[PDB]
Design an enzyme around this catalytic site. Sequence first.
Site, mmCIF file in Angstrom:
data_model
loop_
_atom_site.group_PDB
_atom_site.id
_atom_site.type_symbol
_atom_site.label_atom_id
_atom_site.label_comp_id
_atom_site.label_asym_id
_atom_site.label_seq_id
_atom_site.Cartn_x
_atom_site.Cartn_y
_atom_site.Cartn_z
ATOM 1 N N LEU A 15 0.649 -1.147 -0.033
ATOM 2 C CA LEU A 15 0.017 -0.137 0.116
ATOM 3 C C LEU A 15 0.945 1.553 0.109
ATOM 4 C CD1 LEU A 15 -2.851 1.746 0.445
ATOM 5 C CD2 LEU A 15 -2.338 1.186 2.829
ATOM 6 N N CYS A 16 0.753 2.053 -1.052
ATOM 7 C CA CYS A 16 1.493 3.316 -0.881
ATOM 8 C C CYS A 16 0.764 4.493 -1.804
ATOM 9 C CB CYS A 16 2.751 2.889 -1.868
ATOM 10 S SG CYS A 16 3.887 4.270 -2.154
ATOM 11 N N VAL A 17 0.792 5.421 -1.012
ATOM 12 C CA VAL A 17 0.064 6.687 -1.611
ATOM 13 C C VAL A 17 1.297 7.811 -1.823
ATOM 14 C CG1 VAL A 17 -1.181 8.744 -1.131
ATOM 15 C CG2 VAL A 17 -2.083 6.519 -0.876
ATOM 16 N N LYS A 59 -4.986 12.857 2.423
ATOM 17 C CA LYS A 59 -6.138 13.241 1.842
ATOM 18 C C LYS A 59 -7.245 12.225 1.635
ATOM 19 C CE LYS A 59 -3.392 16.559 -1.056
ATOM 20 N NZ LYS A 59 -3.786 17.701 -0.058
ATOM 21 N N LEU A 111 6.399 -10.465 2.774
ATOM 22 C CA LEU A 111 7.766 -9.740 2.169
ATOM 23 C C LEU A 111 7.558 -8.257 2.260
ATOM 24 C CD1 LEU A 111 7.203 -11.959 -1.179
ATOM 25 C CD2 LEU A 111 8.922 -12.271 0.747
HETATM 26 C C1 LIG Z 1 -11.270 -9.478 1.954
HETATM 27 C C2 LIG Z 1 -10.444 -8.591 1.194
HETATM 28 C C3 LIG Z 1 -9.908 -7.194 2.247
HETATM 29 C C4 LIG Z 1 -8.625 -6.657 1.424
HETATM 30 C C5 LIG Z 1 -8.109 -5.420 2.449
HETATM 31 C C6 LIG Z 1 -7.598 -5.773 3.687
HETATM 32 C C7 LIG Z 1 -7.141 -4.422 4.386
HETATM 33 C C8 LIG Z 1 -5.671 -4.017 3.919
HETATM 34 C C9 LIG Z 1 -5.298 -2.611 4.842
HETATM 35 C C10 LIG Z 1 -3.915 -2.285 3.984
HETATM 36 C C11 LIG Z 1 -2.702 -3.052 4.626
HETATM 37 C C12 LIG Z 1 -1.495 -2.263 4.154
HETATM 38 C C13 LIG Z 1 -0.555 -3.267 4.575
HETATM 39 C C14 LIG Z 1 1.080 -2.356 4.252
HETATM 40 O O1 LIG Z 1 1.258 -2.309 2.811
HETATM 41 S S1 LIG Z 1 1.976 -1.798 5.225
HETATM 42 C C15 LIG Z 1 3.163 -0.454 4.216
HETATM 43 C C16 LIG Z 1 2.181 0.633 4.215
HETATM 44 N N1 LIG Z 1 2.701 1.586 3.384
HETATM 45 C C17 LIG Z 1 3.604 2.701 3.739
HETATM 46 O O2 LIG Z 1 3.925 2.964 5.118
HETATM 47 C C18 LIG Z 1 4.185 3.750 2.679
HETATM 48 C C19 LIG Z 1 4.403 5.164 2.973
HETATM 49 N N2 LIG Z 1 3.249 5.428 3.376
HETATM 50 C C20 LIG Z 1 2.236 5.862 2.936
HETATM 51 O O3 LIG Z 1 2.087 5.597 1.583
HETATM 52 C C21 LIG Z 1 0.728 6.282 3.456
HETATM 53 O O4 LIG Z 1 1.039 7.222 4.498
HETATM 54 C C22 LIG Z 1 -0.304 5.345 3.546
HETATM 55 C C23 LIG Z 1 -0.902 4.774 2.309
HETATM 56 C C24 LIG Z 1 0.282 4.205 4.315
HETATM 57 C C25 LIG Z 1 -1.433 6.190 4.162
HETATM 58 O O5 LIG Z 1 -1.913 7.261 3.308
HETATM 59 P P1 LIG Z 1 -2.097 8.586 3.994
HETATM 60 O O6 LIG Z 1 -1.012 8.928 5.071
HETATM 61 O O7 LIG Z 1 -2.152 9.848 2.995
HETATM 62 O O8 LIG Z 1 -3.544 8.744 4.849
HETATM 63 P P2 LIG Z 1 -5.067 8.880 4.137
HETATM 64 O O9 LIG Z 1 -5.293 10.091 4.614
HETATM 65 O O10 LIG Z 1 -5.004 8.409 2.887
HETATM 66 O O11 LIG Z 1 -5.694 7.603 5.205
HETATM 67 C C26 LIG Z 1 -5.573 7.635 6.496
HETATM 68 C C27 LIG Z 1 -6.130 6.293 7.057
HETATM 69 O O12 LIG Z 1 -5.210 5.308 6.736
HETATM 70 C C28 LIG Z 1 -4.713 4.519 7.746
HETATM 71 N N3 LIG Z 1 -3.563 4.068 7.547
HETATM 72 C C29 LIG Z 1 -2.399 4.529 7.639
HETATM 73 N N4 LIG Z 1 -1.437 3.696 7.292
HETATM 74 C C30 LIG Z 1 -2.105 2.552 7.058
HETATM 75 C C31 LIG Z 1 -1.462 1.525 6.849
HETATM 76 N N5 LIG Z 1 -0.228 0.926 6.754
HETATM 77 N N6 LIG Z 1 -2.375 0.124 6.650
HETATM 78 C C32 LIG Z 1 -3.739 0.284 6.993
HETATM 79 N N7 LIG Z 1 -4.068 1.556 7.311
HETATM 80 C C33 LIG Z 1 -3.707 2.613 7.120
HETATM 81 C C34 LIG Z 1 -4.896 5.431 8.988
HETATM 82 O O13 LIG Z 1 -4.894 4.959 10.132
HETATM 83 C C35 LIG Z 1 -6.103 6.365 8.505
HETATM 84 O O14 LIG Z 1 -7.429 5.645 9.016
HETATM 85 P P3 LIG Z 1 -8.157 6.102 10.258
HETATM 86 O O15 LIG Z 1 -7.106 5.684 11.299
HETATM 87 O O16 LIG Z 1 -8.504 7.501 9.978
HETATM 88 O O17 LIG Z 1 -9.526 5.032 10.434
HETATM 89 C C1 LIG Z 2 4.403 -4.738 4.523
HETATM 90 N N1 LIG Z 2 5.834 -4.687 4.666
HETATM 91 C C2 LIG Z 2 6.275 -3.528 5.052
HETATM 92 C C3 LIG Z 2 7.828 -3.321 4.955
HETATM 93 C C4 LIG Z 2 8.389 -4.439 6.067
HETATM 94 N N2 LIG Z 2 9.664 -4.393 6.009
HETATM 95 C C5 LIG Z 2 10.541 -5.004 4.765
HETATM 96 C C6 LIG Z 2 10.642 -3.982 7.001
HETATM 97 N N3 LIG Z 2 10.044 -3.344 7.977
HETATM 98 C C7 LIG Z 2 10.480 -2.524 8.969
HETATM 99 N N4 LIG Z 2 9.817 -2.012 9.881
HETATM 100 C C8 LIG Z 2 10.241 -1.079 10.970
HETATM 101 C C9 LIG Z 2 8.245 -1.895 9.624
HETATM 102 C C10 LIG Z 2 7.879 -1.112 8.553
HETATM 103 C C11 LIG Z 2 6.448 -1.284 7.966
HETATM 104 N N5 LIG Z 2 5.517 -0.889 7.203
HETATM 105 C C12 LIG Z 2 12.055 -2.927 9.223
HETATM 106 C C13 LIG Z 2 12.882 -2.258 10.261
HETATM 107 C C14 LIG Z 2 14.388 -2.671 10.030
HETATM 108 C C15 LIG Z 2 14.880 -3.372 9.077
HETATM 109 C C16 LIG Z 2 14.216 -4.093 8.231
HETATM 110 C C17 LIG Z 2 12.593 -3.680 8.152
HETATM 111 N N6 LIG Z 2 11.871 -4.154 7.168
HETATM 112 C C18 LIG Z 2 7.998 -5.967 5.508
HETATM 113 C C19 LIG Z 2 6.448 -6.261 5.197
HETATM 114 MG MG LIG Z 3 -4.170 10.356 1.009
#
Ligand SMILES: CCCCCCCCCCCCCC(=O)SCCNC(=O)CCNC(=O)[C@H](O)C(C)(C)COP(=O)(O)OP(=O)(O)OC[C@H]1O[C@@H](n2cnc3c(N)ncnc32)[C@H](O)[C@@H]1OP(=O)(O)O
Ligand SMILES: CN1CCC(N(C)c2nc(N(C)CCC#N)c3ccccc3n2)CC1
Ligand SMILES: [Mg+2]
Length: 411
Positions: free
Chosen positions: A159-161, A168, A411
Amino acid sequence: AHAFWSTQPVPQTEDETEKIVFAGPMDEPKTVADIPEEPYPIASTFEWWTPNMEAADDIHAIYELLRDNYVEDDDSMFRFNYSEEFLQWALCPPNYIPDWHVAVRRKADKKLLAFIAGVPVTLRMGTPKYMKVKAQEKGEGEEAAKYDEPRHICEINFLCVHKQLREKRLAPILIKEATRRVNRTNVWQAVYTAGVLLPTPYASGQYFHRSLNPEKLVEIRFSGIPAQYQKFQNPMAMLKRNYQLPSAPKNSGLREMKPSDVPQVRRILMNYLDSFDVGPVFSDAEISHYLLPRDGVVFTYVVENDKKVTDFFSFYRIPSTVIGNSNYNLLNAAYVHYYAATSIPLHQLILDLLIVAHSRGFDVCNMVEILDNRSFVEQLKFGAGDGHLRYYFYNWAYPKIKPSQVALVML
Ligand SMILES: CCCCCCCCCCCCCC(=O)SCCNC(=O)CCNC(=O)[C@H](O)C(C)(C)COP(=O)(O)OP(=O)(O)OC[C@H]1O[C@@H](n2cnc3c(N)ncnc32)[C@H](O)[C@@H]1OP(=O)(O)O
Ligand SMILES: CN1CCC(N(C)c2nc(N(C)CCC#N)c3ccccc3n2)CC1
Ligand SMILES: [Mg+2]
Ligand SMILES: CN1CCC(N(C)c2nc(N(C)CCC#N)c3ccccc3n2)CC1
């Protein structure tokens, strides 16, 4: 407190999680027919896009988004740089559904703004052992066993924005659209991991790191020189000595895995993973996909002596961009993947993992304390990091388990 997560079928608090005694769904039973055929609404200046991740150019587009916008530390020193080859491997395993890879582009110029990916996994996710005991003591065995059969569900990742579109509320829309696509294929649960705390993990484990190139780790500030080494005339020399490894593997009969190993490796892996409450079930085709060596992506060795494979280990590569050091651009990390030991102690097997990873130019070996990873931490000189990985389900009530009862590598 959570305007999005409060609307979803997940446990809302630890307190609630405390009352969960059986595995099972959270949400109302529904059918494909109940799910909207039309994509979730999105603003008129954006559009949904399904990348073809078997097509080099589309993989490249998603690679760039992640390279520039995926997970980084708070001090913005390192950002993950998953390779194109790694993304194709991670997102196209056997029988994947192309529709589960979901992107947003800006309609005008087609800039890529956001991504999320689901892949199939077959997961054991029935009531854990310690709760099946509680159920036996209560005369509630039938309810506890209802969901024992491995389930074909979705694993979500990537997941990535885009940084310019943060905060937003785009992430909720991406999640809703992904859930729709998954539900349209008659799949109702997902599993995901994150570093951040959301409602509500069923397990959490700390990360551990094993230094392979300590001089570079210190240079880039991944590591510091621990205070005790300052009592030495040459702190760095002593640090390098401390992490030195053999130049060649120690186990007789270690060699790279090949296709003919797949049945043996599947046997010993699946026998081992059975011991854990939550874990994947892999077919031969999935064992081939996730474990056969792939250049710059996944590395897998078996121990074979006298014509029988008795042990194996695997690791995969995730590099990170080092943001503005002058000597180095990249951190080359090896991550402990699946393994199984039947002939030798686990620490002896994993030492060969460190040796091969070091030989191949990896800087650090990482892992979470899942599986039996805690069993070789001290001897192999891993140390706990500041990070955790939290494990979550979507639409599945599940009793809290310890990380050493989780066998799903994410992963
Ligand atoms: C049956 C099938 C179901 C399939 C779906 C299963 C669900 C899968 C769920 C996803 C599993 C992903 C697993 C991975 O990939 S974990 C890796 C996630 N990626 C990153 O950390 C990359 C860098 N960061 C970003 O790209 C953004 O900050 C993201 C995209 C993470 C949020 O974008 P942004 O910062 O612009 O915020 P917003 O204004 O759009 O949205 C705000 C809302 O988002 C909630 N939020 C923030 N971070 C996460 C997070 N990591 N999982 C779930 N929710 C998250 C947050 O609490 C808030 O909700 P609420 O607190 O207001 O309620
Ligand atoms: C979904 N997902 C996201 C990236 C994750 N990752 C490869 C990963 N994540 C670390 N942290 C702290 C959790 C980050 C998140 N979300 C980390 C820290 C230190 C050294 C290696 C590391 N590797 C693994 C799986
Ligand atoms: Mg956003
Ligand atoms: C003080 N200090 C804090 C950073 C540093 N570290 C261990 C670290 N490295 C991260 N990445 C992207 C690359 C790690 C790998 N393999 C990271 C990502 C997300 C959250 C935390 C994180 N922490 C360790 C040194």
